[PDB]
């Protein structure tokens, strides 16, 4: 009669909380999805070994179209867990799944875990300063989406930072690199001409948040657009005007260029 | 030899990540601060038991003025951990502590944990739609803070949701309730008369996120301002423009008035 939405955390199998693990171990059935994000520092096998339960993976269609006939039926007579990377309900559509549970007479509880939304705090950028967030999508066919560029413009205009998620093809396991993200934004700038993203724009790249050795880099596009940030996934941030302490942290921790202490503060 | 910034999570000792627990267990010295937030479902005793180490609690003064005198010295010859509620670098000034560590020749690592910043997901509000965040502070003497009101105005203007961290006076055991926050806001509205926060404003309250049964309520200020939302900690959220599914979740899960199902596009 109970469904537990349990977050898996940022990087590897140890990013799940003690509460989430203990609850997952007591569940009769455990489902998981890895289409919204992928746990780059571990594997399904390692996660299954830690939880000590067989994990049935669900595709996007399984969830969005058939959550009520795949997961909920079992949650009516047993304790069921639904595992997701990061913090449950961060993914836009996930919250609605609790409404489906209700309508099916199934109770649901949420067990939180670290999310990139809060983990980006490791860049030294003040969390309260983040504005609306967005996702950089690949252009294709006759479709060139550029809304993420407008998001950056509006936030920046108000001195706010912009958290940018990069495109991902979970199934195909193909990621968009921060490098590719920068190339696309430069292309959009050439069309929009809004002076929002140029070779002189200061950006921050975060890779493998959650690991003991994440990659945190900050600098100007002209210098970072060809740098090697390691294996995906990458997160790109376009910070608004920086608080002095933010710039110093980037300089001291992320090896940012001295220049930003005077140019972007 | 090294310093660990380890987050403890939202509610109780089990909100720490497996990674954080296993590392905390093998540290020679463990320090902690419990003034940046309230973990209403645990005690120092329970935390010490889980980690199996004695924890020396530091005050805001100990940290902000003497971190390099109390913590760092030991990190030069031992493995030290500094524990904090939620995520160590979120809505705190702890990021700056890493600079002190570096300048002292001490390498540091960060172990994230569930944070209120991402936990807002349980409100059903799309996380990407939150804009600049703010803190509602207790007026002090003739000083009556009001900046948070302008933040709400800026966000609502963009149709973005506003997350409001609430004040805390740890040494006085004082934790601002959502009720007190709304009262202060109504008073600021009377002074500024910007039509930003009135009795008809839709607000969302999230109390004791992280527990298995947090209080999640949504509705008009006039109806919520005197409602008992349970023990602290609380956060107040003032949504911007709602998507259909957001409104639906507020009604179905947060008990909002069914008329809120209708949205003014
Ligand atoms: N579990 C919880 N439930 C509701 N509000 C919470 C909360 N934890 C923190 N808060 C809010 O956040 C404020 C502290 S700011 C510190 C946040 C912490 N670093 C984190 O990552 O979560 C509290 O005063 C309250 O306003
Ligand atoms: Na945000």
From Swiss-Prot, chains A, B:
Belongs to the diphthine synthase family. S-adenosyl-L-methionine binds at residues 10, 87, 90, 115-116, 166, 209, 234. This is Diphthine synthase. Gene3D superfamilies: Cobalt-precorrin-4 Transmethylase, Domain 1, Methyltransferase, Cobalt-precorrin-4 Transmethylase, Domain 2. It catalyses: 2-[(3S)-amino-3-carboxypropyl]-L-histidyl-[translation elongation factor 2] + 3 S-adenosyl-L-methionine = diphthine-[translation elongation factor 2] + 3 S-adenosyl-L-homocysteine + 3 H(+). One of its GO terms (molecular function) is diphthine synthase activity. It comes from Pyrococcus horikoshii (strain ATCC 700860 / DSM 12428 / JCM 9974 / NBRC 100139 / OT-3). Pfam families: TP_methylase. Homodimer. Keywords: Methyltransferase, S-adenosyl-L-methionine, Transferase. It comes from the Archaea. The keyword Metal-binding does not apply. PANTHER family: DIPHTHINE METHYL ESTER SYNTHASE, DIPHTHINE SYNTHASE. InterPro entries: 4pyrrol_Mease (IPR000878), 4pyrrol_Methylase_sf (IPR035996), 4pyrrole_Mease_sub1 (IPR014777), 4pyrrole_Mease_sub2 (IPR014776), Dphthn_synthase (IPR004551). Pathway: Protein modification; peptidyl-diphthamide biosynthesis. Signal peptide: none annotated. GO terms for biological process: methylation; protein histidyl modification to diphthamide.
